[PDB]
Amino acid sequence: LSLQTFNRDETAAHLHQKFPDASESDVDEFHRLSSCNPRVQALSLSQNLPLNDTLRLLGPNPKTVEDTIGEVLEKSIARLRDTAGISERAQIDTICSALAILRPLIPLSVLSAISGVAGSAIKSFALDLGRPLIVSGETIQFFDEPAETWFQRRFRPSAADLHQFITKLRPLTKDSSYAASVLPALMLEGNQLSELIELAISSQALPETSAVERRDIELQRLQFALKAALRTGRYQDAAKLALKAGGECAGDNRQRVLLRDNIDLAAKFVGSNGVQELVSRNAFPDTGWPGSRNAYYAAILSEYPELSGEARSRLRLTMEWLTNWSQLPDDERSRQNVTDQDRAVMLIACLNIHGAEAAARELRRWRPRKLSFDAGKIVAMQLLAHARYDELDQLAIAAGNDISLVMGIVLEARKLHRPVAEQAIRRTWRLLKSQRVSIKDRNHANNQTIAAITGMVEMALIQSVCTESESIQLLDRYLPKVPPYALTSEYSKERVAYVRAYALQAN
Amino acid sequence: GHDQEWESIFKDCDLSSIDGISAAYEKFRNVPEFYSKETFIKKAISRVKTGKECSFITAIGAIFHWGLYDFKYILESIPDEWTSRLSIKTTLAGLIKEYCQRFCMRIRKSRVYEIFPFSLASRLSGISEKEIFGITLEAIAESPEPANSDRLFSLPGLLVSKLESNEALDVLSYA
Amino acid sequence: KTGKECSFITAIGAIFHWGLYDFKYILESIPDEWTSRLSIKTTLAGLIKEYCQRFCMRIRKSRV
């Protein structure tokens, strides 16, 4: 018989003993980041740290208290060797050699095949050693970068190990995208150079897979055959390979930005395994302030329920970097631009993980209230595309007195002929009637005030929220008495809004 | 003019030692005006004693750990008389090899602008240009980093020194 | 109904576990408008392969 690890309810009943008021998402984050292992949970909770620090030390790239890297890890691995049985120590050394050479998302089956060790021994080794390793699903990972670098320098394999790994690995390449992607980097180490050259030059086969994976295998083959050709004096083939490889490299670089900028489609047409592998390999580049990547990684993970516990832990890591940016001097801060697209993706991530109200609170922390209008249009477009009407209604109600968000939402909702929840429109109509609004551009053109006011009036009319006297008073407050310029320029952005507004006031 | 600024900068600065060069550079930095590295180089060459030049070249090559662009100045500044002595030639050959190995992912041959003057370095050191491209290529073959697109589209301009013309025509027809 | 055709094709292929002769009718019955949409083409391309693999000992080319 076999005995089974904790489920979610067991972990919740464990966690509420120390912190009897933790929320569901805290239970989710604590259940994911501890591999459902009771000893790990007890060991972490025994420190009597605050709750947020207890979660933070289980997250990616924790506080590097070690001034001289790798010191305690050497002792831990030595002590693990000394206490093991006489049969186990070769297997421990083999696992150490195997982790130093593979690409970073290792499935346990391939590691078991190439090393010959049973999977449960690998899992028990990783549970004994603790951080920097982690086991989740059927995958092994490192969670800290200089620890990983020191490990890859300290335990680099020998020639006989490499020969065994190549011989074991090569038959699997007919079925696995991972094996086909990994093999050339091992052949370059093994000095099987000519086989690598003829592997890249000739039309050697591939497993059945989508385009996003096939591009990777093609590029890796070319990139390592170039090195082999230069090492064996095959200069004509080297020049032809360089010309062939430049376009593939540029195509990969152009592909990754396209995936980054279109999270809504990318999360849907790529499976969850590919989504985890994109984060693991660190594929997205930054967008002008040093911690930007983690904003998008938080978003794309949040589309899947079962990855939710990881998603929060990435979002938690983002708010550190943003905090640092807020503390720079003004001249330095003026050189690190933060765009409205970033605010939109952070708003989407927080809405998916926490809720509408917690999403709405953070948008009020940015000082010029123009920014709420800018973010609100993008969020409304993304939500209306996928027919998520009730979530948009909840976000509209939760906005409170931050009327710019509502005025953006109704402006985007009017274009697609969708209704909006009447509670928020009644409240914001009540606020509009008595106080100034001006969505002022820094540019002296494309002032959006007329379009937003007209959209509000159209929405109020179609729902029979207001009287016509109120509408006349409101339009009369805003329409200029002399004609503005834009009526006689065919490329001025403002023209159609004025034509619509004057026609509506006249009728 | 401005001579006494120089007479203050080189005050007790032993240019034959490593430390005196750094002291002189800090004295140059003390009153921020007229920054032009070549002027400091030229004057320090004007002040070195007889028979200790090679110490100066090795020191000035070592101290500032020169970037990609700046190295051009030193080769440009050496007096012609110094070419008559063979120790100087072998020292310059070693210092050229140091640079060619340190920046193998960024050296290229261009029509727009000449970052590194191959012909001048070749004449001063005695290493022919066909050896300099080989020194760059073997350092590329050893390096652990992957290449970028700009490195990949400038390798044929280096590999072309190896090929016979009948092979280069095939490469062109392929391209 | 519009927008659920591929579900119909996959279902009607799957349910009856068709014999050798009967498969002919399905290809014969599909309307021409159905050809304009790329999902339908990839679904049919997926369905042909299973037939070609299931009956490899009986498929032949004939004049009669």
Added chain:
Amino acid sequence: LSDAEKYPLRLRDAIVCAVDPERAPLSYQWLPNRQNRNEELPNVGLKGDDIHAFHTCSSRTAEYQSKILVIDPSGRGKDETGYAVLYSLNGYIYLMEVGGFRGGYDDATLEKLAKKAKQWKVQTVVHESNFGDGMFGKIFSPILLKHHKCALEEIRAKGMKEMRICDTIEPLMGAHKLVIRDEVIREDYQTARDLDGKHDVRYSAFYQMTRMTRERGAVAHDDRIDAIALGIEYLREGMLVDSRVG
């Protein structure tokens, strides 16, 4: 006759004045009239484009808010490197020099540009960047720093250059926010020299401006008006700074 939409840009819609280098009036009002029309400046514009001064302005004067120099470096082959000098105050944008130097990255051109950055007491140097070139700033800065010191900043723009120029200048000129220093109109017209030194109007900035169209075959030469467009766009977008509280 296509006279209203063949050429978007007209010289009638901008103020020309001999502004003071240190203070300027805080507002202006526009009315082209015989009293305000100039008659002595050379004018390459099409028939009916007459240079006019302002009609009335405020008596209250203050120092300018920001001061930019813009550079468009020469590409492949021999062409002139373009540059422009612009300041700003409230909605108004002031243009005070435009011209060009012929050559490459030789020391003479860069020395002249550094001295020009010194002469007007500029505050920021801005330039266009393309294709991952990466050279020009690294080359130029150690030459600049011995004359004047300030930050250097790159941009890259995208799309149809002709439509970008038209769609940048036309909203600004329609709001009549553009004030031009007087002698510029002469200086450009004097400096419009071919390689041999012969006079040729095709190198004049205002000739390039008045023949601009929203077409891909619009004009063969653009080196000065492009620097004007990038200066306008940078003064338009660069003023914003955000903050976060909590």
Added chain:
Amino acid sequence: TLHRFSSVCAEISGLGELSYHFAELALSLWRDEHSDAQIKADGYIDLSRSLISLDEPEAKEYFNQAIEVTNKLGDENLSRWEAILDLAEYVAGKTQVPPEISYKLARCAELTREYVDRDKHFAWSDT
């Protein structure tokens, strides 16, 4: 405008077929002609996004086209052309050259002039 029509007609009952029609017409205006790979890659993304609420297996295929098209010509030209010139001016003085190679070099020069924006970025005299 066509994308907006495609999106709106998907929610109205009984108008669904037009959602395909307005898509294909929108494809016809730019699929045949020259443009860079990024501008082309952006169009299939909007085609894909317009049809999500209606027929998701059809929406997937335009995403596959968007991923596939990114290999083609783009900003990386004028780097490739310099390598071609570096080869050609090495081989030029030494041997006889067949006429068809010389013809194809000029044909590709005429092709590569079309993609640049400003004329000053193209190497006339060297070519």
